[PDB]
Write a protein that binds this ligand. Structure first.
Ligand SMILES: NCCCCCCC(=O)NO
Ligand SMILES: NCCCCCCC(=O)NO
Ligand SMILES: [K+]
Ligand SMILES: [K+]
Ligand SMILES: [N+]
Ligand SMILES: [N+]
Ligand SMILES: [Zn+2]
Ligand SMILES: [Zn+2]
Lengths: 341, 341
């Protein structure tokens, strides 16, 4: 299957991440894309193409315009204000705050952020646009008839909500892809988020919408980032009623348990009548992942891809998280092997 | 006039503050208390006493119990979790999040925080309790008939809301003092916050209460910390209808303008019928303050103290912010000279 990948991911090469009270090099760094690309090619997925560029048509249907405007100028404004580090939010509109949007960069960066560990750096916006473009071109391949494609997105997307960045994410690539599929003629689409972390940004975007079903398997938010969404009770509101399905799971979860949640999520998606599934693929579910507490093995990713593809509807696989260890590439490639086999 | 001050402020000696995307030495440093104490003594206010210790009776009436429990153990839990830096929140319950409280330290520190620049460090809880005690003992002096007293609080308090820390603050000393005055028999009290920054914590505590009038003069939150409260439209809710009065002001504001808002706030307090006024005194309104944009001069603080005391009701002055230069002490002492003269 075709792999869509932009070298412009490298424009996001942030120096710092706030982790454990320290400013350290970020987990979500360019070497991840290098490792994943090499592994997918090694596994025989060597039909790699750059995305065409895209403007904001599709993304404006899932993200707020003010938010996108903010991201486009955030770095320039931060630098113009004289700050010496990267652009890191510290004040946030938490409980019982005004809904008003500040005018300055310090206030706006907090207004538009859900998670302060993620610094905005020079090139971040351009990189995010390239990653979005990979998702859009992957979606277009599915819309045009392919049954599988892989968008090697970096930066990742699933923590970016309607109007907030965080969790290493700026533009919700999977949400843009789902929207693209709707725009190309689908009436019903599902996003299945198998990254270790809850896709709170994706959930937010579609929570009141009934055209896109959102399912996520993830570490229990009571004890895992993103901490403030992803409970099983969240099933949707309004037009979105019954089209969010969260499967929080605990420490040490192995495939024998995780796979039961996968089966159930696919039942839900099939009952909803999805015409295609956008898979938000993070491999931070791996037993060696440095920031995560599930215990999937490399062979389990083959099983995972096979099971998702046995839905018998077309798949767009969209890269999310997975850190640290050389096996992030093997693990991604293994999902694709399961899909293609 | 009596000055209440605890040497246990020095138990809060954090190494880091997130400012401009860097971890820098904190502005709210122990040497502040040293500078202020020395200047007030130099001005003739040498009746300095340590507070008696206090338990949680008063403070539980203004802060949430879970919040206080969290502060008590935060440092220990952070350290036990293996993190190498000081305890700094990054994920926050912002727009459209679950209201649930996480169970782990990573989730809880965000749940209970409004502002990530403020690190929890060893000794912080102990220091915050001593600062609260200084406010309580000051309040007790006013309750017993003194017309003025100064509680040299450090850490400051006015950004600590019902259940969140931030802005260098953990326990809202001024709120605790106001509550103490009610408990000792007052029916109506006012808090007048003249620190450059909006007392969003104080506002939060009393927003739905009609027993404590809250007035604040501050940099406009559209372009100043705390960014998400302090607009003039916020006048109260429920039982608190009409008993919050915010006076946001812009860049370069001098006393000729600032003092007009002071006059108005005192008119409102008098119409409310406050039996005493707790003054949240920050001197970060000074023209040299490193993080603030007002242009008060050292002589203006004498005028300020005189005007507030011309209310003819008892005053408890509670220390808040004011940074960078040893003249913070002169400026505080000048307010006290205006009160005492
Ligand atoms: N402070 C911990 C931040 C963790 C962010 C994890 C983001 C991630 O990998 N999402 O898939
Ligand atoms: N990133 C700027 C944080 C500013 C905190 C100021 C808190 C303060 O001085 N309050 O009175
Ligand atoms: K997930
Ligand atoms: K103020
Ligand atoms: N949905
Ligand atoms: N109030
Ligand atoms: Zn993840
Ligand atoms: Zn201040």
């Amino acid at each position: 299957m075709r792999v869509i990948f932009s070298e412009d991911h490298k424009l996001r090469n942030a120096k710092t991440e706030l982790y454990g009270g320290e400013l350290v090099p970020p987990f979500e760094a360019p070497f991840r894309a290098e490792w994943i690309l090499a592994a997918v090619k090694e596994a025989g997925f060597d039909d790699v193409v750059a995305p065409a560029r895209h403007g904001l048509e599709t993304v404006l249907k899932v993200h707020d315009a003010g938010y996108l405007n903010f991201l486009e100028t955030a770095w320039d404004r931060w630098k113009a204000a004289g700050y010496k580090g990267e652009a890191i939010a510290t004040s946030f509109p938490v409980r019982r705050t005004s809904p008003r949007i500040p005018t300055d960069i310090e206030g706006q960066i907090g207004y538009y952020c859900n998670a302060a560990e993620t610094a905005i750096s020079p090139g971040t916006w351009e990189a995010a646009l390239s990653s979005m473009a990979s998702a859009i071109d992957g979606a277009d391949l599915i819309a045009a008839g392919h049954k599988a494609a892989f968008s090697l997105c970096r930066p990742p997307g699933h923590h970016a909500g309607i109007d907030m960045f965080g969790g290493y994410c700026f533009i919700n690539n999977a949400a843009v892809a789902a929207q693209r599929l709707l725009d190309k003629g689908a009436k019903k689409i599902a996003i299945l988020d198998v990254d270790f972390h809850h896709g709170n940004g994706t959930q937010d975007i579609f929570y009141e919408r009934g055209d896109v079903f959102f399912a996520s398997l993830h570490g229990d938010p009571a004890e895992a980032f993103p901490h403030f969404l992803g409970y099983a009770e969240e099933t949707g509101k309004g037009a979105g009623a019954g089209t969010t399905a969260n499967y929080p799971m605990g420490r040490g979860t192995p495939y024998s348990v995780w796979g039961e949640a996968l089966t159930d999520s696919l039942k839900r998606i099939a009952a909803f009548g999805a015409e295609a599934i956008v898979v938000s693929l993070g491999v931070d579910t791996f037993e060696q992942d440095p920031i995560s507490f599930f215990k999937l093995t490399s062979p389990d990713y083959i099983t995972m891809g096979r099971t998702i593809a046995a839905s018998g509807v077309p798949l767009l696989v969209v890269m999310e998280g997975g850190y640290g260890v050389p096996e992030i590439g093997l693990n991604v490639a293994n999902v694709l092997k399961g899909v293609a086999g």
